[PDB]
Amino acid sequence: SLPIRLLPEKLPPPKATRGCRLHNCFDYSRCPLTSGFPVYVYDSDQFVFGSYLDPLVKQAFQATARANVYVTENADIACLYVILVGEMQEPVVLRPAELEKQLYSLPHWRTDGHNHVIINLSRKSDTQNLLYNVSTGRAMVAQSTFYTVQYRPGFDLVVSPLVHAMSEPNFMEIPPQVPVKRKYLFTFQGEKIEADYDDRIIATLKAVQDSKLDQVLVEFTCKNQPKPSLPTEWALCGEREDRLELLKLSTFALIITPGDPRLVISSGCATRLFEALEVGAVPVVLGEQVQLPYQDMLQWNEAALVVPKPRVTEVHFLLRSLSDSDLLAMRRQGRFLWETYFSTADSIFNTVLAMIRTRIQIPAAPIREEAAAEIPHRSGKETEPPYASPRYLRNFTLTVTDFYRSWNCAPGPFHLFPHTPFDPVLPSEAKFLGSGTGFRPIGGGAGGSGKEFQAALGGNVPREQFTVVMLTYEREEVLMNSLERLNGLPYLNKVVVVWNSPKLPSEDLLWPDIGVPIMVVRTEKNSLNNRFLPWNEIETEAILSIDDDAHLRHDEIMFGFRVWREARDRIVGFPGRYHAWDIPHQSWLYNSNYSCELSMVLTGAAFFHKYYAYLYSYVMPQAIRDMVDEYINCEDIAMNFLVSHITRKPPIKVTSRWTDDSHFHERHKCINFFVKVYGYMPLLYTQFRVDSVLFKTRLPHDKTKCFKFI
Amino acid sequence: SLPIRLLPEKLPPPKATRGCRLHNCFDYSRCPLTSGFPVYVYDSDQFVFGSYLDPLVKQAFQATARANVYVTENADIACLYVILVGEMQEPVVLRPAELEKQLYSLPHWRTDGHNHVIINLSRKSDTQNLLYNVSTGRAMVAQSTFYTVQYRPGFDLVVSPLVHAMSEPNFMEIPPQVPVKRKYLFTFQGEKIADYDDRIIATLKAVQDSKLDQVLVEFTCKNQPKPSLPTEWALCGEREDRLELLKLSTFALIITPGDPRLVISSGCATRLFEALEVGAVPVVLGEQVQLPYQDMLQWNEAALVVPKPRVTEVHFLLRSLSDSDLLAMRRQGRFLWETYFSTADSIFNTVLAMIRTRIQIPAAPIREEAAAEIPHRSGKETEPPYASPRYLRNFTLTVTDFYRSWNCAPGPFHLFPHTPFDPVLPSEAKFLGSGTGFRPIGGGAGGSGKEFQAALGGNVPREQFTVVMLTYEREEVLMNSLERLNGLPYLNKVVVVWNSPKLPSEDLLWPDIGVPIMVVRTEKNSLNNRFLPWNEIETEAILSIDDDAHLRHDEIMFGFRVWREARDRIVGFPGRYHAWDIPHQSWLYNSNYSCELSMVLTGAAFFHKYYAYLYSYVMPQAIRDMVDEYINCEDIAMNFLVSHITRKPPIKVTSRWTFDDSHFHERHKCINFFVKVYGYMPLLYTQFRVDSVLFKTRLPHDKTKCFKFI
Ligand SMILES: *[C@@H]1O[C@H](CO)[C@@H](O[C@@H]2O[C@H](CO)[C@@H](O[C@@H]3O[C@H](CO[C@H]4O[C@H](CO)[C@@H](O)[C@H](O)[C@@H]4O)[C@@H](O)[C@H](O[C@H]4O[C@H](CO)[C@@H](O)[C@H](O)[C@@H]4O)[C@@H]3O)[C@H](O)[C@H]2NC(C)=O)[C@H](O)[C@H]1NC(C)=O
Ligand SMILES: *[C@@H]1O[C@H](CO)[C@@H](O[C@@H]2O[C@H](CO)[C@@H](O[C@@H]3O[C@H](CO[C@H]4O[C@H](CO)[C@@H](O)[C@H](O)[C@@H]4O)[C@@H](O)[C@H](O[C@H]4O[C@H](CO)[C@@H](O)[C@H](O)[C@@H]4O)[C@@H]3O)[C@H](O)[C@H]2NC(C)=O)[C@H](O)[C@H]1NC(C)=O
Ligand SMILES: *[C@@H]1O[C@H](CO)[C@@H](O[C@@H]2O[C@H](CO)[C@@H](O)[C@H](O)[C@H]2NC(C)=O)[C@H](O)[C@H]1NC(C)=O
Ligand SMILES: *[C@@H]1O[C@H](CO)[C@@H](O[C@@H]2O[C@H](CO)[C@@H](O)[C@H](O)[C@H]2NC(C)=O)[C@H](O)[C@H]1NC(C)=O
Ligand SMILES: O=c1ccn([C@@H]2O[C@H](COP(=O)(O)OP(=O)(O)O)[C@@H](O)[C@H]2O)c(=O)[nH]1
Ligand SMILES: O=c1ccn([C@@H]2O[C@H](COP(=O)(O)OP(=O)(O)O)[C@@H](O)[C@H]2O)c(=O)[nH]1
Ligand SMILES: [Mn+2]
Ligand SMILES: [Mn+2]
């Protein structure tokens, strides 16, 4: 039933509007937990704001809003109303009290603005503060500049400046994250045009430069004129492009907050933060009174040092005491934050929406999937029928309860997945004490040797099946034979066959009958990235990805499946490979030699969770899929990069199995290009493989091996 | 150099005291980052407060403070000054403005109380607000009742009520965590003597009356309610009555006060305390509330916090949580309750650790076990022993890693020399400027068994291990197992824990194995002594080995290499498992040959020294008591500890299994007693073991196996 309705205003004083929070100014009755999060976006061209808006801000905002999955044209169902009011073109023509009157005139303002968010995105000006003397009713405000008297914490949003309006950033112009230490340990550029700690900061930082214990470069005036700025701020110097050239050479970048403690955040402070994260300079913010973009959801200490101004006398020691792996961890998290929430208009709009939505406990929209066109066909000639894995069992838990990881760990909070490899496991007594649906413990829980083992999946999670995904192209005869080797496979739910050839399968084809369905899917084009699309016909969590020419025995498939049920976030597989350091060229090589150390497992024969299919196809960078289609190669390398980036673990190699020239050199090019897209090498090494527990173990007579051969 | 000094008051208005924050009212010059965190505690028996204090509060606080590592009697070096002012015996004699004057009279108040924390711990009263009319200068306040006017976020502290004053809580009266669902879905008991309260009552009654679930909601008390603040839902009965119903509740409702200015109250904090205490997952109606320690704890992992207007959806929401998610919230509530709420020591440690953390100073180093070496005389790769570097992450573990520090076990109170959770460098960093200590196989080209034996490789810099070997009255076998160690690569030293009460014989010739052999004396004979953090252990890696174990050198080297890639786990040879006793609904120790394992016995395993500190000094005493009673089960206890911390099974290396009846049955009793201590069974199952990557693989002639036999 519907949430209780907020009672509206029947004008309100500034004490009242400063007192607004969700618990007294937001109408939850428009927003049932199960009605989605429909968002109404006002067309700013119908209101006075449109013609005063900065043109690039307006254009990038309208294009993002048009493409957004939550936006609805039906104001009657909307939970949230968005009005874009800035930033405005300078000099600001419109007077404050006029800006107020047009806000109170918006079509769905009702009496007070409840459930509206006012968006005001900075791009060229660091001195605008359009809403300062404006009464906003019960609306929330999203902008980059706030004084204390205007910031309502937990209700307003501090957001990032819009830099890449009507453009795309170039991930190739970002310096690599390694080497850790750059030319300068830290730098700062600014100018101030006049408790005052500012004078001890300057004296301490100058003394560090003059000591010549580290290479630093600190400058408290600009070569030319400084950009205008708010009072007591350290104004920016030069153009975006000048400042970046220096920050690209800095291990750390100083950000000295404004001298007036009432300036909670400013356009200028957030710009410096934006620019430092953009190129991997770890921010060092002096002044704990600041509110950084998105601070209610992001743990900023993981990407930035935030330090009271009185500890300036200890900054030099502190920056010298951080290890290389801690410092590189901070750089790697600043890249995640900057890409996900700062870098484009889409990033920013998705962050505003997702912040408001999470604060009111509504799950994200469900990530799309690949609607498949089945190619119907005709077939030729344990004890139960296929069962799908349950879906969407954690809507509230992944949104609210897992708040920290949702927002501070990749891939971020914007999508709802049908399932994930990070679901917590039950303690091992719960299956015997009331939570046993689907559990199949070996030997009823007493365990045993090979007899009992083969009679039950066991493990720490309920039983399930897996889906085979088999890519094929112009190989109609070998396909039918390998499809037949799957007859009798335990726990097989269905086979999905991805038909890449442009010529459909001949009408007169007698596919085998293997006891489970065989769906043949049509592909709008011929790509190796098509094996990782999240086909709606895949109804399990587990995928066994296999080439139409791969020869796995049934016992291998079953041992791999049980390993993966205990390593659900990993690529678990058979073909082990590794990346080799090209010593003279200081670069990477693909290496498939026999080896005692591995770092990739090829997806021509491996288990992985369908979660990574959604990521590979819709969240990972386009430049990587672009390159897979160019070389018709390397999709297995890209998927080991993705999974090892998300998990920071190597893959897992199962059993002792191990199985032209311009193709092989395409794989050195791929490894080195993928490293430029990510900023670093995510692959890691393992010095073991997994076998069954009693592999090659001598046993008494009343005991049996788990498998005959593996 | 010292931090910049805060400029003192030369009386201040209420607008000034309400704006105090660390950035304008704390004097960082008393608190350099590297001078520790010395705390001065005023003796409240010298000031007016002492005779009015509740005597049990006063006695429990003074006891904790006398035993606290940070506390000093030298007020000249102190960074923080602590004064206990409450709670006071009822009816409260002392008038407000008097309490103000004794505060300004404190010996080291100086002019304004800077760097003072005022502590006011509740126990018996739910109506006290001692400091409401009291000017506090620049001092922080730590207490359980705050109105909005008085609460300074980020500066004041919301703490737990002091329930077990001068007592210890009994962990065996805590109902077990499983089964997940208990008799009632939720319960509530209280009486009350925008206004959403009427719809809440109506809604919750309708849920009771629907008989879709078993619930018990009562909006008056059997007898007279405890006194409370206005608009509060007052507590009913005595602590022992409320807990008997909560013990049977899956969820406990907490309905926050009707006046939104009452940010938190003793009565709300008591309901939170009692719910967590017995495993009822709190459901808090009202987001305006500030829960204890909320600046540091992510409460959404332990409680559902829900706007009052969404009461109409609470029933739907409680039914939609999966079993594994509800259990994870119960297990997190227990961690929070025990670490920060349960005793006077918990509370006082938490107040100190909050303020210390907020000013970026690391925790006191955990103690180690000063070894008394027993000098002895000895009989008759190319480098000399190197110890592991220590304390490389003081700032990062305190500030950067804030979330895990506070919200994951073991909590934030100790600084360890090193941990198994240090982040790993991306694999190109060893070649591009961070290569100190790294020994990659084939210099980064890799290879086969030849190169693999020449270099540890891996993802971490090289290091060594220490053998710890327990012995008791087996003088002849000891010398012989010590001699098996001669020649072992990467061995730093051998620490021999001499558990026999009779010293070694003076005429003893110990072997000379090429490294030192330290023989340490034990004050008593305990199996716990193999897990004490002897200050002679100079490495991170420990190879725990009984005096009668035969490990070959290759086994040790492959085990060491697995651990270097699995640093948080027990990595070892002897696999065992816990088996469910189907008729008695309880656990059994089982050592049969098995295809599924859950334990690795520490009689032959690698683990990180970090877990010796935890086993000895943090893990509950009752577990070490039982190990001493039966002289048994130290290996089951350490498997419980490590699987509790990591929620992962151990790792079993190679095919080795090979190595009276009242001993075997003591092990059933340990497993089932430990489950009572923890509240749940932490062990988990694995259906694989590890072997080298080319174990039993058919290799060309230009390639060599990693090891000859494993
Ligand atoms: C099994 O393991 C072996 C041993 O590690 C691998 O052998 C290496 O293969 C790589 C790539 O094929 C070789 O590296 C390349 O060398 C080129 C010049 O090599 C000559 O010189 C060596 C000895 O000095 C001869 O043995 C060889 O026959 C050649 O005559 C460079 O031009 C290459 O650089 C290219 O790519 C990089 C990107 O990283 C660019 O910077 C360059 O401009 C260029 O475009 C590269 O360095 C290496 O020499 C081989 N080692 C040995 C000892 O022979 C096998 O490839 C591996 N097998 C499999 C299947 O993976
Ligand atoms: C290798 O694997 C086997 C098979 O799982 C293990 O055998 C089991 O051993 C356990 C414990 O030793 C046995 O469990 C106990 O059973 C007692 C009654 O058993 C009788 O009945 C069976 C058949 O019904 C006979 O075969 C047996 O010889 C006996 O005559 C119970 O009384 C025990 O309960 C005790 O502990 C619990 C705590 O959980 C308390 O609550 C009780 O009060 C009581 O004090 C217990 O349930 C089990 O019967 C054995 N199974 C079989 C088939 O023999 C081996 O132990 C294992 N070996 C190794 C080395 O691990
Ligand atoms: C969890 O979220 C999913 C996705 O938003 C919900 O699934 C939708 O449920 C409605 C109502 O049954 C259906 O009409 C849609 O077809 C479903 N969408 C999809 C993509 O499956 C699900 O109901 C939510 N679960 C809970 C417990 O709230
Ligand atoms: C990290 O913390 C440790 C533990 O407090 C510091 O170690 C102490 O340092 C002082 C001065 O160097 C010595 O006199 C003590 O003996 C040390 N204690 C121990 C237990 O070794 C260490 O200096 C800190 N490191 C940094 C970089 O701040
Ligand atoms: O243009 C192409 C070429 C290949 N494939 C598929 O890609 C996989 C890998 O190709 P192949 O087995 O020929 O490589 P190999 O593993 O033999 O080196 C197989 O499933 C092919 O059917 C494809 O979909 N399109
Ligand atoms: O009172 C005792 C009994 C045993 N042990 C040690 O405990 C370990 C394991 O004991 P034992 O080998 O006797 O058990 P087993 O492994 O042979 O069953 C050995 O290192 C013993 O020296 C000990 O320190 N004190
Ligand atoms: Mn193939
Ligand atoms: Mn032994």
Residue numbers in the entry:
A (entry chain A): 154 to 163, 168 to 351, 373 to 559, 579 to 856, 869 to 919
B (entry chain B): 154 to 163, 168 to 350, 373 to 559, 579 to 857, 869 to 919
Authors' own words:
The completed linker tetrasaccharide represents the point of bifurcation in GAG biosynthesis: either EXTL3 adds an α-linked GlcNAc and initiates HS polymerisation or one of two closely related CSGALNACTs adds a β-linked GalNAc and initiates CS polymerisation. We show that selection of the GAG chain type occurs at the priming step: CSGALNACTs are capable of initiating CS synthesis on all GAG attachment sites, whereas EXTL3 requires specific features in the core protein to initiate HS synthesis. Structure-function analysis reveals that acidic residues in the glycopeptide substrate and a basic exosite in EXTL3 are critical for specifying HS biosynthesis. Our results demonstrate that modification with CS occurs by default and must be overridden by EXTL3 to produce HS.
In order to explain these data mechanistically, we determined crystal structures of an EXTL3 dimer lacking the coiled-coil (residues 154–919) in the apo form (1.58 Å resolution) and with UDP and Mn2+ bound (2.10 Å resolution). The latter structure was obtained by crystal soaking that also included TetraP-BETA, but unfortunately the glycopeptide was excluded from the GlcNAc transferase site by a crystal lattice contact. The large dimer interface features an intermolecular disulfide bond (Cys793–Cys915) that staples the C-terminal tail of one subunit to the body of the other subunit. In this model, only the terminal GlcA is enclosed by the enzyme; all other linker sugars are surprisingly exposed (even the GlcA is less buried than in EXTL2 due to a Trp-to-Ser substitution in EXTL3). The Xyl2P phosphate group is ≈20 Å away from the GlcNAc transferase site and close to Arg907. This arginine is part of a large basic surface region spanning the dimer interface that has been suggested to interact with the peptide portion of acceptor substrates. We found that EXTL3 specificity is determined by a basic exosite >20 Å from the GlcNAc transferase site. The failure of EXTL3 to polymerise a long HS backbone is likely to be the result of weak acceptor binding at the GlcNAc transferase site: without assistance from the exosite, longer acceptor glycans are likely to have very high KM values, preventing efficient elongation.
